[PDB]
Design an enzyme around this catalytic site. Sequence first.
Site, PDB file in Angstrom:
ATOM      1  N   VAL A   1       0.851  -1.190   0.000  1.00  0.00           N
ATOM      2  CA  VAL A   1       0.000   0.000   0.000  1.00  0.00           C
ATOM      3  C   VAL A   1       0.891   1.246   0.000  1.00  0.00           C
ATOM      4  O   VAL A   1       0.577   2.255  -0.635  1.00  0.00           O
ATOM      5  CB  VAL A   1      -1.095   0.028   1.139  1.00  0.00           C
ATOM      6  N   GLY A   2       2.027   1.157   0.678  1.00  0.00           N
ATOM      7  CA  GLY A   2       2.952   2.280   0.741  1.00  0.00           C
ATOM      8  C   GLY A   2       3.929   2.161   1.888  1.00  0.00           C
ATOM      9  O   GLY A   2       3.922   1.174   2.624  1.00  0.00           O
ATOM     10  N   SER A   3       4.773   3.175   2.027  1.00  0.00           N
ATOM     11  CA  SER A   3       5.813   3.179   3.050  1.00  0.00           C
ATOM     12  C   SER A   3       5.889   4.544   3.730  1.00  0.00           C
ATOM     13  O   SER A   3       5.731   5.584   3.073  1.00  0.00           O
ATOM     14  CB  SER A   3       7.172   2.815   2.431  1.00  0.00           C
ATOM     15  N   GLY A   4       6.137   4.536   5.039  1.00  0.00           N
ATOM     16  CA  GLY A   4       6.275   5.783   5.806  1.00  0.00           C
ATOM     17  C   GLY A   4       7.709   6.082   6.220  1.00  0.00           C
ATOM     18  O   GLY A   4       8.659   5.523   5.664  1.00  0.00           O
TER      19      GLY A   4
ATOM     20  N   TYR B   1       9.107   5.239   9.179  1.00  0.00           N
ATOM     21  CA  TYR B   1       9.705   4.127   9.930  1.00  0.00           C
ATOM     22  C   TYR B   1       9.127   2.726   9.629  1.00  0.00           C
ATOM     23  O   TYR B   1       9.061   1.869  10.516  1.00  0.00           O
ATOM     24  CB  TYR B   1       9.687   4.446  11.430  1.00  0.00           C
TER      25      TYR B   1
ATOM     26  N   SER C   1       7.091   0.079   6.140  1.00  0.00           N
ATOM     27  CA  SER C   1       6.277  -0.041   4.941  1.00  0.00           C
ATOM     28  C   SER C   1       5.077  -0.898   5.300  1.00  0.00           C
ATOM     29  O   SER C   1       5.178  -1.777   6.146  1.00  0.00           O
ATOM     30  CB  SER C   1       7.076  -0.692   3.806  1.00  0.00           C
ATOM     31  N   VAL C   2       3.954  -0.633   4.648  1.00  0.00           N
ATOM     32  CA  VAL C   2       2.694  -1.301   4.969  1.00  0.00           C
ATOM     33  C   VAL C   2       2.162  -2.053   3.753  1.00  0.00           C
ATOM     34  O   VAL C   2       2.137  -1.511   2.640  1.00  0.00           O
ATOM     35  CB  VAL C   2       1.628  -0.307   5.451  1.00  0.00           C
TER      36      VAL C   2
ATOM     37  N   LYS D   1       2.314  -4.069   8.864  1.00  0.00           N
ATOM     38  CA  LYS D   1       3.473  -3.178   8.890  1.00  0.00           C
ATOM     39  C   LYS D   1       4.718  -3.889   9.375  1.00  0.00           C
ATOM     40  O   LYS D   1       4.763  -4.421  10.484  1.00  0.00           O
ATOM     41  CB  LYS D   1       3.222  -1.964   9.797  1.00  0.00           C
TER      42      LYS D   1
ATOM     43  N   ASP E   1      -0.879   6.655  14.208  1.00  0.00           N
ATOM     44  CA  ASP E   1       0.474   7.205  14.525  1.00  0.00           C
ATOM     45  C   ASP E   1       0.612   8.144  15.727  1.00  0.00           C
ATOM     46  O   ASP E   1       1.437   9.073  15.717  1.00  0.00           O
ATOM     47  CB  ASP E   1       1.148   7.796  13.283  1.00  0.00           C
TER      48      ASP E   1
END
Length: 333
Positions: free
Chosen positions: A26-29, A31, A33-34, A49, A161
């Site tokens: 789905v994406g990465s932040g 800290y 990736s999900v 995650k 978060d």
Amino acid sequence: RPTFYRQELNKTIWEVPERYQNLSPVGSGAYGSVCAAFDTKTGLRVAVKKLSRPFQSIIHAKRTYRELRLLKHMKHENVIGLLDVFTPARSLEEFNDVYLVTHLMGADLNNIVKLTDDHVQFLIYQILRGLKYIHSADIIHRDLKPSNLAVNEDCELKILDFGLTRWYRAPEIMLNWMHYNQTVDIWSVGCIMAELLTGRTLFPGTDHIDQLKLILRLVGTPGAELLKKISSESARNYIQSLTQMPKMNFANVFIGANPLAVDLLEKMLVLDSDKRITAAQALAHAYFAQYHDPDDEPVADPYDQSFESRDLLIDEWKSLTYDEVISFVPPPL
Ligand SMILES: O=C(Nc1cc(Nc2ccc3c(c2)CCc2ccc(OC[C@H](O)CO)cc2C3=O)ccc1F)c1ccccc1
Ligand SMILES: CCCCCCCCO[C@@H]1O[C@H](CO)[C@@H](O)[C@H](O)[C@H]1O
């Protein structure tokens, strides 16, 4: 113990129990990736995650611990909750990877509001309700913003978060005020709600100085009563030599909005954080009478944040995190 299967996904390796199928990014932040996965035990779509470099440093290790502790504590409809936590490791000596599993929502507020008064009413209501619950554990979010709000198709919302851009940050944060009250988060809700009703970022500063100029433009330069409370010569001198702006009329600014939403925005977007409506109080405002139920607006069990003041070794944070993984007791639904 379950059996794991391995898989290369976007330069990263993913090793997860077999109960989790059809992993897709789905994406990465910042800290981690999900991935979106299917959960064969529930028939439900989940968010998985994988933490990136959970023990890279003492602050990472402590950050990893912090996220796990927060996530195990939150049992609320409008706050991200933990379905599962796992590691592919058989032992502490092996322990180097953490995966967290939550409900899959399908979008963030960014994605959905780019609304109608009833949509806004419902979304802000649910944000406030999750905040009431977070705030009651003496947890402050500090970075509420649309990308931290997970929303599905039913317009149900979870705060992500939460605990420890600048467009949503209270003014007392961009001035690096020592300490903050919980209503830093109410400001951010003000900013989100404003955006939902108008289609525009309420305060789209280029930087911390511009940002602040926009706030004082809407809200007015502080009067002597708020100034009384600013120790810092630095901060106080800037403000005092500043271009004295009056507080605009919100009725004018938000022309067309429900006046009950204009009124709430007025009570949220006060510079003096002591004068901001709290999350409890906001839930009882007239704007939300069709959602507000005093007996379905829960508070949280006490949250032990003592670990926060402690300075420990990587291996100690790593081992505390391991204890948290092993003792994880799932929710029954
Ligand atoms: O929130 C903390 N940790 C934490 C955070 C997450 N984050 C999540 C989860 C779910 C979602 C999103 C982000 C992003 C929005 C989104 C967008 C698209 C999408 O599907 C599109 C795709 O096309 C499917 O069809 C699904 C979602 C979504 O559902 C996941 C696990 C965690 F553990 C935390 C708490 C405290 C401290 C630190 C961190
Ligand atoms: C320059 C415009 C921003 C100045 C006003 C922001 C002050 C926010 O309000 C302040 O928050 C502090 C906590 O951070 C409290 O301890 C103070 O009592 C309160 O006045």
